[PDB]
Amino acid sequence: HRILIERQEKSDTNFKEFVIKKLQKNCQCSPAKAKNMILGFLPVLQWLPKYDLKKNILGDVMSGLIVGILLVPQSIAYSLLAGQEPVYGLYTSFFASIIYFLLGTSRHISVGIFGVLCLMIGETVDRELQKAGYICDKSCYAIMVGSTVTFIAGVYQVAMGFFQVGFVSVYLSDALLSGFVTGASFTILTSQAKYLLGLNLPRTNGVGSLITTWIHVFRNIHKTNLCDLITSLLCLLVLLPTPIELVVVVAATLASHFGKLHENYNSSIAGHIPTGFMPPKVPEWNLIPSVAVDAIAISIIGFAITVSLSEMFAKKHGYTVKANQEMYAIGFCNIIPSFFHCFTTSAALAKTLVKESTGCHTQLSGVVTALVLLLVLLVIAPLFYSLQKSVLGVITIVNLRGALRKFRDLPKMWSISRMDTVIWFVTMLSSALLSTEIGLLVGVCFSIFCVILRTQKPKSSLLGLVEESEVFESVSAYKNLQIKPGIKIFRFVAPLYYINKECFKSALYKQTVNPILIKVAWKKAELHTIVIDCSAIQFLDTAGIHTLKEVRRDYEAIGIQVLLAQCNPTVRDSLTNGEYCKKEEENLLFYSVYEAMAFAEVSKN
Amino acid sequence: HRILIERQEKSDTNFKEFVIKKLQKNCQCSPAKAKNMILGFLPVLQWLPKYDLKKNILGDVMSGLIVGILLVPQSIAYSLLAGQEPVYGLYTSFFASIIYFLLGTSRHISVGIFGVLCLMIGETVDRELQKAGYICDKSCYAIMVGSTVTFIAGVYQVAMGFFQVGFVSVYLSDALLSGFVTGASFTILTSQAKYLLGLNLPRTNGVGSLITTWIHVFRNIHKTNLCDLITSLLCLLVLLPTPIELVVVVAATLASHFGKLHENYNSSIAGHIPTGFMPPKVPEWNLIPSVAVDAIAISIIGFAITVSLSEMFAKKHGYTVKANQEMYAIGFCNIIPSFFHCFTTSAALAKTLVKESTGCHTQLSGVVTALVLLLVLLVIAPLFYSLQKSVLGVITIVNLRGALRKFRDLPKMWSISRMDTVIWFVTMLSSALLSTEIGLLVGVCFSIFCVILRTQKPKSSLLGLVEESEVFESVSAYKNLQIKPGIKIFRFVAPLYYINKECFKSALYKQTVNPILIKVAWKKAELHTIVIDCSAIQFLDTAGIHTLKEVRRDYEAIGIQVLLAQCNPTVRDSLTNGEYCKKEEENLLFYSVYEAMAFAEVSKN
Ligand SMILES: [Cl-]
Ligand SMILES: [Cl-]
């Protein structure tokens, strides 16, 4: 008794008429739903009118001043890492917070300056500064280039949000992103070492910069101020055990101002800007083609990190974050502020962690931080003068510590997925050495190739029956399975295609007869059926269809029957389209391994 | 009653000691087997002493003169396409045949000049000629560059043979190679159009050359000789229906010599060389770094095509061709002749087809061709003077026709594998336009990405039981399957990893409850078990382990049980290593979908 399943009728509707009908059903021209899109595009007018202030005002207000003071050195630093004046980091943070409060659904994430992104902006800035030469007084050209790159990144992000092409985010694996952030953290530490030691080594760019910078540091170690070094050592000793950062920076600034440490030729930040808020300057609009390629990566890593963090903190509690709206928000946190003097913004884990430790479920707290920043941007900025600039490096290293600790999870990573660990290590090496962008590209492709390698050398085994059941499983992995003689079931856990067709043939020949050599031996001068378990064969390429046909023909030439079992509907469709089973030949494809085994047993009898 | 299969004990031998022991068992220092390696490396002293001359001498001798005369215009042409003097093509063909008779196992293949490879050599030659400027009198530098590239390609091929790294050949799919050869044939036709029309348009190189050459042809169409055009039209008319080529070239040469067609400013080949065989010149040995990258592709496409053709013609009858020995042979068909004045060699289908039509199973015929070439290289070369050079273009186009006919198989290709057809079309476009090398790289990566896309959007469905059996199959593909209520089996035919984890979650939520929205609705204010068929899940990434854990946790939060069935041994190992089933929790993983369904039915009762 053979199975006689009947296939369902395929849908005849495949033209664009049905697509147009379903697009109209989607109501592109939506009456009375334009308010919904306005509310969807402006989440701010959805929870502020329904704000439970009596239960969250204290939480939002609390630690907002601490976070704002805590966002203060981060800006004066990463701006320096980005090749920008310190006031530009403050502008970036304030504008990012204010705009994300307008457009934002995570309600727990901390948008603003991201170290990895600032390192990448810095690379593009220095390249354009050199390609140009070093009323653009160096810093003016730097901020112009940074704002242009930010505008391009925001345009790309909003285009990906509108075109619904955000699925590219799936190509950035969590392990690959962790490796990239670790490598970028190593690069940031190497860059900040020069400020930590007080040297004046030249700008190093290109593949191997990390090594060039370290070599320069070693070469110029004798030109050590020994004052900034002492301050940095004390700050590292105090902050390594880990509000501590705010106290440290306040005490360091007070000591530097009182003792006049600059008399020892101590490098310090300058009077960057007064209350300021200078009138906005439009982007270059002519330099836009030159720095588009870098903006590609900046936009991707920016939106990938933001979406990942927002989804994580939404699924933690009250998951109501829309991916497309966060696309639009992170895009507009890089378009409107780029009209002003700001660089790219993204979610920062080290500062979101600070708000998570002390805070509540209200985005209004970010506004408070902005207000604090605004206050810092109005009258408290001169109070930040006379910073030792070694405390800045200590403050950057301490924050990176979060990403640098990932090396302690390598034994745990290995004990779960070896190839994921290898991808992580390769991405970390390619980001630390080589280039940050080149490192990301190397990581994304190596992960895709690892998926190709996993396919390339797959598992292949013989199947045995489980006693008193209709279950077949690998003999090479399980024990005490009945294997009747003259029938050998071969399971090949992989898609059969151009990459692994040779491996499939070699494994089948090694475990069963290898009919080619037998045929040549017969021409010069036990087994009767073989069942191929196609349950794990995901798809079939033209090579796979040809390989299966060749296998069947070569085995039938000797006299060994070949039966295919548990084929997918798509695999069966490919086999019928590939002209494998001829027309109504029958007894060639089976719906289960048990059915094929029973048929093979009956055929000999 | 639950299944209680016991797993086999894993092998404790994993260190390098066992590898060293098996390497010694391989007998690296082999006594009395050095003769075997000598015979293996020199196949010539394995069938010549055992040559059945009485049954194959007539076949080998027959059509050898025709093939040699037929290899004559092919050289005078493709050398011109390769930016070389015509005598260099004759040298290449003669040396390739002679050396492959020494080292060769296919015994039916025709090594020699390959059109696609000559086009690629030409590109590298013209670039180096320009990078240098245009006792190297242009042609001397061209042959020096070509010989250097050939030496590098042969070194790469022999290195791949010795290192056993020939598996790279699996990345060049048959459809991708067919597309590349079609695009390269289009490029060759475009290049030979200038000789067909008799114009003198400038050298065009870079991406889009095909378009630049065609634009130049259209611009200079008015400068048509109308004599070479008439000769080419007559030759095309005669040869298009398709020994015909030899008669055509002989008649054209005789007519040109008798009528003195060169009086009409007809471009013609010159007195390239006398009997010649000038003393060999060593490769550049200093220019070797510059043209290594091009030699990478030349070596790969050369060895891939040669191995494919040899394996095909061996498996057709008497399969005794070793892949590694053919690696060595094709490498040494590019190393020793590069010491002389020759360029790269590979199997040519159009000329192997000529020998297949008229020939026998003896490589000695190739020697005969070499002899003919040698005779042509000794005294018959001046007889080939005064060739119209339009017959050459006609002779190149006719031969390409074999690869150009592939466009007629597109409807057949679509009716078998749509993605393979798309890869073929993309590779053909990237080889015709863009660059030949860039086209190959674009094809190889797009095929790997298509394997990634096939994974990205996979099949997912609900499984129903087949009546009076223990077989579950897709409800969306088959008909009349029992689906008990409260239990829904979800089959996801793909590996679960970072790329398709979101798709897996979305499909499972769409077809079953979507527990997140249900949980938020329950907090604001039928199904009990779900069985996941992991039979088609090939592997599990760190993301896949996390996704499965998250799915189980979220479904158990609502109150819906999640059971995993038919997991691979590797998938089970990943789940245990990933801390998914805790310790001895039981009733979480099942060996069959029927077992899980029975357990789910029992649990409610
Ligand atoms: Cl950071
Ligand atoms: Cl060809």
Side-chain angles (χ1 to χ4, degrees), chain A residues 78 114-116:
Chain A
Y78 281 137
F114 190 30
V116 179

Side-chain angles (χ1 to χ4, degrees), chain A residues 31-32 34 36-49:
Chain A
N36 291 315
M37 149 286 302
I38 285 279
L39 297 163
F41 191 56
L42 267 309
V44 51
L45 324 168
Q46 285 283 94
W47 55 288
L48 206 55

Side-chain angles (χ1 to χ4, degrees), chain B residues 63-64 67-69 71-83:
Chain B
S63 190
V67 163
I69 274 319
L71 267 147
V72 179
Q74 252 92 155
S75 10
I76 302 157
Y78 281 137
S79 47
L80 287 212
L81 180 75

Side-chain angles (χ1 to χ4, degrees), chain A residues 78 113-116 181 185 188 348-350 400:
Chain A
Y78 281 137
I113 278 174
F114 190 30
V116 179
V181 169
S185 295
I188 295 165
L349 179 62
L400 289 180

Side-chain angles (χ1 to χ4, degrees), chain A residues 5-6 8-9 170-171 415 420 447 449 454 456 459 473 475-479 498 541-542 570 577 591, chain B residues 5-6 8-9 170-171 415 420 447 449 456 459 473 475-479 498 541-542 570 577 591:
Chain A
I5 306 166
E6 202 70 64
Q8 261 166 23
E9 291 45 58
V170 313
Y171 297 113
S415 147
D420 276 276
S447 325
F449 187 66
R454 258 188 228 98
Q456 202 146 320
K459 308 291 148 26
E473 262 164 8
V475 188
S476 72
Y478 297 97
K479 208 161 40 204
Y498 74 99
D541 189 278
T542 34
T570 45
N577 262 317
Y591 290 107
Chain B
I5 306 166
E6 202 70 64
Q8 261 166 23
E9 291 45 58
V170 313
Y171 297 113
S415 147
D420 276 291
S447 323
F449 183 64
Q456 202 146 320
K459 308 291 148 26
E473 262 164 8
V475 188
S476 72
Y478 297 97
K479 208 161 40 204
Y498 75 99
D541 191 272
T542 36
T570 45
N577 262 317
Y591 290 107

Side-chain angles (χ1 to χ4, degrees), chain A residues 77-103:
Chain A
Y78 281 137
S79 47
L80 287 212
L81 180 75
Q84 309 293 155
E85 301 276 50
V87 71
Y88 298 144
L90 275 69
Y91 283 147
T92 279
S93 298
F94 155 96
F95 267 95
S97 302
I98 273 280
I99 296 203
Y100 197 84
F101 146 90
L102 268 39
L103 286 81

